[PDB]
Amino acid sequence: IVGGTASVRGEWPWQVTLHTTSPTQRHLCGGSIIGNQWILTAAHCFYGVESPKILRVYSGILNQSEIKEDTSFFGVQEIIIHDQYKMAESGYDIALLKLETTVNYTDSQRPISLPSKGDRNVIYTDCWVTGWGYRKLRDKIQNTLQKAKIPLVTNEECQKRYRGHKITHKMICAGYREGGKDACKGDSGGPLSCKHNEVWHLVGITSWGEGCAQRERPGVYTNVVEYVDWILEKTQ
Numbered sequence: 001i002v003g004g005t006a007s008v009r010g011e012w013p014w015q016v017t018l019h020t021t022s023p024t025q026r027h028l029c030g031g032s033i034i035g036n037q038w039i040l041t042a043a044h045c046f047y048g049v050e051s052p053k054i055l056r057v058y059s060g061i062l063n064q065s066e067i068k069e070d071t072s073f074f075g076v077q078e079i080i081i082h083d084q085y086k087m088a089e090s091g092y093d094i095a096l097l098k099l100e101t102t103v104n105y106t107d108s109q110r111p112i113s114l115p116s117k118g119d120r121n122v123i124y125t126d127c128w129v130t131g132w133g134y135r136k137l138r139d140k141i142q143n144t145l146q147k148a149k150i151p152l153v154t155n156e157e158c159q160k161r162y163r164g165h166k167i168t169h170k171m172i173c174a175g176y177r178e179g180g181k182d183a184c185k186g187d188s189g190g191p192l193s194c195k196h197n198e199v200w201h202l203v204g205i206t207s208w209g210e211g212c213a214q215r216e217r218p219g220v221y222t223n224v225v226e227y228v229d230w231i232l233e234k235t236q
C-alpha cells in the first residue's frame, strides 16, 4: 500500500495473508474471509502454484513477524479459479480457496459481506484498500498491515487512462487524480472494502495497475458484484 497508515489488531478481520511454503515460506497474496471455509482472492496469485499443498492461509495477522513455527494456519483443500481467467489485465481475476477446516469467528477473524442484492446502484464513498504490499514500486513486503482510503473512479474515466487495455464492467477502478495512495506489489488478492450504512462490503479484489500511485493511473480491481452468482454457485 502506497501512502497508507498502519492498521491495528481487529481493524480488518476479513483480511488474510496467503503464504507459499516452497521454496521458502513467504507472503504471496492477500485474501478475504467470505464464509466459514472460504477465502476470496485473485486468480493471478496461483501462477506457477503446482497444487494447494504448498499454500497456507493465516488469519488474525497484523504483523507478518507474528508468523512463527507455532502460529496456527488453515490448509487449503481446493483452489477454484474462474474458468475464463487468462491474465489479470484481461479480467476474470477471481478465485476461491476452500479451507481444510472452518474458521471460528473472533474479533480478529470474521467474514465480510458481498455487495448486497438491491445495492447494484449504490455510490460507495468510503472505500479502503489494505495489505502488506510495497510502499512504492521498488520496495519489499511490509511487516504491519497497511490501509489507505481510495476514491472509486468511473469505468469511463478508468478506460481513458488505460487505452491499451479493455476496462470492462467486470472491473472497478480506484485512485486519486494526482496519485499518492494506491495498492502496490504484494497487495493483490486482498480486499477493496467499502462501508455503506455502517456495514462493510467486499466491493473489489486488488488485481493490477501499470505502476503504483501514479497520477491519473487508478488501480484496477475485480468488480465483486459482477461475480456474486459465480461465488454463490461455487460456495453451495
Ligand SMILES: COC1=C(c2cc(Cl)ccc2C#N)CC(=O)N([C@@H](C[C@@H]2CCCCO2)C(=O)Nc2ccc(C(=O)O)cc2)C1
Binding pocket: 026, 027, 028, 029, 044, 045, 046, 047, 133, 140, 141, 182, 183, 184, 185, 186, 187, 188, 189, 206, 207, 208, 209, 210, 211, 212, 213, 218, 219, 220, 221
Ligand atoms: C501488476 O499489478 C500488481 C498489483 C497492483 C494492483 C493495483 Cl490495484 C495497483 C497497482 C499494482 C501494482 N504494481 C498488485 C500486486 O500485488 N501484484 C502482484 C502480481 C503477482 C503475480 C504473481 C503472483 C503474485 O502476484 C505482485 O506484484 N505481487 C508480489 C510482488 C512481490 C512480492 C515480494 O517481493 O515478495 C510479493 C508479491 C501486481
